């Protein structure tokens, strides 16, 4: 608007799209990013309750645009007369940019947005910076997960460090796929395509990461307090038992689903122990968890134990006195899912007025590029 | 007078000022608001933001605002500015599950009791529009299960699993004004232990605490089937009665002399406390099981205008039934 109170910020993901206005602590709307065609186009929430009678397609993968003919139809649904009702000609937008994205894709979304939509202001922001802007910090380490891949990225004052960014190729999709394989060995057959969103509710409702594996197995072998009954839309009742704490442990032991690596706990260690010595303490104290695939119960309480044990037998071998002076702390507020949005809700509020943050429309009328 | 809402248990219940609407939580991650259209209860609204079991609700009447807390380490403040309720965010900084929530008499702070050996007193800040918390943690060794507020908007009673009942002060200088002198004490900084009780040898977990209308008397129930009343006017003195029934899960003052209790026996009871320092059992109030409630009663509240003049009281519990009891 004239005073600037029509800035809209949206987080685009592979599984869920979260759009809202600045100055609010909550997303205005969340919806899954499904577009499909029957066997005209059913886009958005309608592609969730019915998908056995519909062919689906996911138009993104870790920020990489799979098809440049479906994102337009999704963005029309977002910026259309069913969710946000915006007058598109008078608005400014703040978008996310995942770590390590290629140049052509970065300047293709900026190119297509000024042309077929006629906004008035565009900015693209790195998610690692936004996650810490919502926490009050400026230097830290972001361990973000979701449905793509799990990134671990440090950040110094305002600017990320792409040289020291690491990635692990397991996320919520691999865990919910592994749960199908585990449930297959009980007499319960769920096909890969049409029942993907039925086992996802089972994963969301009944799964947790164990603190001590030993007591978990003792309770699983000599006690029946882990088995729970889940009702299905058809009316059947299935029973899920010891499979609750086996599916989430592909993260800490990645070889169980044929992925070569070191796991999230050890990859974090290998990332913190690869920078200059002076700033290593600045990263130990401030580790922030973000994303929807870090809301399992116990995942906060396991990484602390793993890092303390990995730092007491690799760096300070033996001599268990100085660990008390060594302070390690992990921050994980109960608002982990939308921390990309909330950061975007702050950065658009502070810098709403001064007209250098945004990329002006007139800049691409003459130059066609940007340096900010 | 019994009414059966749902077959599932009721975790917690809240009333409003006119006793027209009721907020319930049917053992799930949702809150249901019901109103009364004539002579039948019909559901009105649903509130759903938690992703965990909801454990406590309360309704500030004069401001008309609902505070909700649950086991997902979250708390929300629901307000009605349009036809649809909307939430507001609360920063609590706890790492274990919350267990109890309660508003203050002046409706400017609220106290949350949690399982991290903490008590969180939260107050409002408008420069960026959320609630910010302060912690009381010094003498507590275990999880808190009950809370109550003094009429003078400073002192705070607490019961915990470490077999102690404590009285703290929660004076926040940014919001509150300076208090007067009470029999409980004189010097009242924030987070300072004012009094402590719980020495009886075979002490059990304290499930419920409550203050009187005068503010100079405290009462609490324990899991060893005992009720106790502590007086502070004549002197810091206690009187404990050892009942021969199952444990009691809630307590509330009706007047300066009588106290009403409920628990797993499914039947509310009335005790009398004389001015000389003696507790005496009086009677039950409900003279399949031979009792209207079919399971343990979890919460006791007052239908009338509270401790100044109380006539009727409400009971709810695990059976799914809600009952109104009248003394007359």
């Amino acid at each position: 608007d004239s005073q600037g109170r029509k800035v809209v910020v949206c987080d685009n993901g592979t599984g869920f799209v979260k759009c809202g206005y600045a100055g609010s602590n909550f997303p205005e709307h969340i919806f899954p990013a499904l577009v499909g065609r029957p066997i005209d186009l059913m886009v958005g929430d309608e592609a969730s309750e019915l998908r056995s009678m519909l062919e689906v397609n996911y138009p993104m993968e870790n920020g990489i645009v799979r098809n440049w003919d479906d994102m337009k139809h999704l963005w029309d649904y977002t910026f259309g007369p069913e969710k946000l009702n915006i007058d598109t000609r008078n608005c400014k937008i703040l978008l996310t940019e995942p770590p390590m994205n290629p140049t052509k894709n970065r300047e293709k979304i900026v190119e297509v947005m000024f042309e077929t939509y006629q906004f008035s202001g565009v900015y693209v922001a790195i998610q690692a910076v936004l996650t810490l802007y919502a926490q009050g910090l400026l230097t830290g380490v972001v361990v973000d997960s979701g449905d793509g891949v799990t990134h671990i990225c440090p950040v110094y004052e305002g600017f990320s460090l792409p040289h020291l960014t690491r990635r692990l190729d397991i996320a919520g999709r691999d865990i919910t796929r592994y749960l199908i394989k585990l449930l297959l060995l009980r007499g319960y057959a769920f096909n890969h395509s049409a029942d993907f969103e039925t086992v996802r509710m089972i994963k969301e409702k009944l799964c947790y990461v164990g603190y001590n594996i030993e007591q978990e197995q003792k309770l699983a072998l000599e006690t029946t307090v882990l088995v729970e009954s889940y009702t299905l839309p058809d009316g059947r009742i299935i029973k899920v038992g010891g499979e609750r704490f086996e599916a989430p442990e592909a993260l800490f032991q990645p070889h169980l689903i044929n992925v070569e690596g070191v796991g999230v706990a050890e990859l974090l260690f290998n990332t913190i122990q690869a920078a200059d010595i002076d700033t290593r303490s600045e990263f130990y104290k401030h580790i922030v968890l973000s994303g929807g695939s870090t809301m399992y119960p116990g995942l906060p309480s396991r990484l602390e134990r793993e890092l303390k044990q990995l730092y007491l037998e690799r760096v300070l071998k033996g001599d268990v006195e100085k660990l008390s002076k060594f302070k390690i702390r992990i921050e994980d507020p109960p608002r982990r899912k939308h921390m990309v949005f909330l950061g975007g809700a702050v950065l658009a509020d502070i810098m709403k007025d001064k007209d250098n943050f945004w990329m002006t429309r007139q800049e691409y009328q003459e130059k066609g590029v940007r340096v900010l | 007078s019994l009414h059966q809402f749902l077959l599932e248990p009721i975790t917690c219940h809240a009333w409003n000022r006119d006793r027209t609407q009721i907020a319930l939580s049917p053992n799930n991650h949702e809150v249901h608001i019901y109103k009364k259209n004539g002579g039948q209860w019909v559901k009105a609204h649903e509130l759903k933001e938690h992703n965990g079991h909801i454990t406590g609700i309360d309704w500030a009447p004069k401001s008309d605002r609902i505070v909700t807390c649950g086991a997902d380490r979250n708390a929300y403040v629901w307000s009605q500015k349009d036809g649809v309720w909307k939430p507001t965010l609360v920063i609590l900084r706890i790492n274990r599950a919350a267990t109890f929530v309660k508003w203050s008499p002046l409706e400017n702070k609220f106290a949350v009791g949690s399982g991290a050996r903490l008590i969180s007193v939260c107050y409002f800040e408008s420069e960026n529009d959320w609630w910010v918390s302060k912690h009381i943690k010094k003498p507590i060794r275990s999880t808190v299960l009950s809370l109550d507020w003094h009429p003078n908007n400073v002192l705070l009673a607490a019961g915990s699993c470490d077999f102690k009942c404590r009285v703290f002060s929660a004076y926040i200088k940014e919001v509150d004004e300076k208090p007067a002198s009470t029999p409980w004490g004189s010097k009242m900084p924030f987070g300072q232990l004012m009094s402590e009780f719980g020495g009886s040898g075979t002490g059990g977990w304290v499930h419920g605490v409550s203050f009187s209308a005068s503010g100079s008397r405290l009462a609490w129930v324990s899991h060893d089937s005992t009720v106790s009343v502590a007086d502070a006017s004549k002197s810091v003195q206690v009187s404990t009665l050892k009942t021969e029934f199952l444990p009691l899960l809630s307590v509330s003052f009706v007047s300066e002399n009588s106290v009403v209790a409920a628990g797993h026996d499914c039947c509310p009871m009335l005790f009398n406390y004389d001015d000389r320092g003696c507790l005496t059992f009086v009677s039950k109030l409900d003279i399949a099981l031979e009792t209207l409630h079919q399971n343990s009663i979890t919460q006791v509240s007052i239908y009338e205008v509270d401790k100044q003049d109380c006539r009727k009281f409400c009971t709810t519990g695990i059976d799914g039934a809600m009952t109104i009891w009248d003394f007359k």
């Binding site: 009050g136 110094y156 702050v346 340096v371 | -």
Partner: peptide, 30 residues
């Protein structure tokens, strides 16, 4: 050898308040 950033210094931005506002958030959250 290299600075803390582990990159060449960006002279364009060197040639050319958020921190004030972020302190209240840092106080309230932590």
């Amino acid at each position: 050898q290299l600075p803390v950033t582990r990159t060449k210094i960006d002279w364009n931005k060197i040639l050319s308040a958020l921190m004030e506002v972020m302190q209240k958030r840092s106080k309230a959250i932590h």
